[PDB]
């Protein structure tokens, strides 16, 4: 049902299992209901979780899709995480 994603600084993010398996990397780390990310801090991993929600909500919707916001101060680390998770 839910899985726990733990950031490098110890924040625990609990997201729906279906949303987490969007990432092929997470699917492999799970297959446990818990994944530790030694390299991804909480200000990045929280944004990753909001991307999951946004993606699931707006994929295959013929309404108007809003832009996914990314503050400049986190963009570089978010890019690294997205590159690693293939997100």
């Amino acid at each position: 049902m839910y899985v726990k994603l733990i950031s490098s600084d110890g924040h625990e993010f609990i997201v729906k299992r279906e949303h987490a398996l969007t990432s092929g990397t997470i699917k492999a780390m799970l297959s446990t209901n818990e994944v530790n990310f030694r390299e991804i801090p909480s200000h990045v991993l929280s944004k990753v979780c909001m991307y999951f929600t946004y993606k699931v909500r707006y994929t295959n919707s013929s309404t108007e899709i809003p832009e996914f916001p990314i503050a400049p101060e986190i963009a570089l680390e978010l890019l690294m995480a997205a590159n690693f998770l293939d997100c």
Binding site: H11, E12, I14, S46, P66, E73, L76
Partner: protein, 103 residues
């Protein structure tokens, strides 16, 4: 309409959605399924305001257009250890580093 939430306590953050018409108590039932603590051991907050079990999320100001998938609204959560409720504490996420000179 769906509202998208982060339910936060200490260093725990639950990402979930709920209906604007669903109640605060029904959200505690969601928290219960996840963190295994019954509703009577939970207090839910909007900022510093304690939320009443019978109110709907919409009445408490969680609306589909503010509690968005890409920018969810925060619900604070506090547990009763046995007697008395802990104070509401939410640990902030980490701080981003300084913007590199090229930016």
């Amino acid at each position: 309409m769906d509202v998208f939430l982060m339910i936060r306590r200490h260093k725990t953050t639950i990402f979930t959605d709920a209906k604007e018409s669903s109640t605060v108590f029904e959200l505690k039932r969601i928290v219960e399924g996840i963190l295994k603590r019954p509703p009577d051991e939970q207090r839910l907050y909007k900022d510093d305001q304690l939320l009443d079990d019978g109110k709907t999320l919409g009445e408490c100001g969680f609306t589909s257009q503010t509690a968005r998938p890409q920018a969810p609204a925060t619900v604070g959560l506090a547990f009763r250890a046995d007697d008395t409720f802990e104070a509401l504490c939410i640990e902030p996420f980490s701080s981003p580093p300084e913007l590199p000179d090229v930016m």
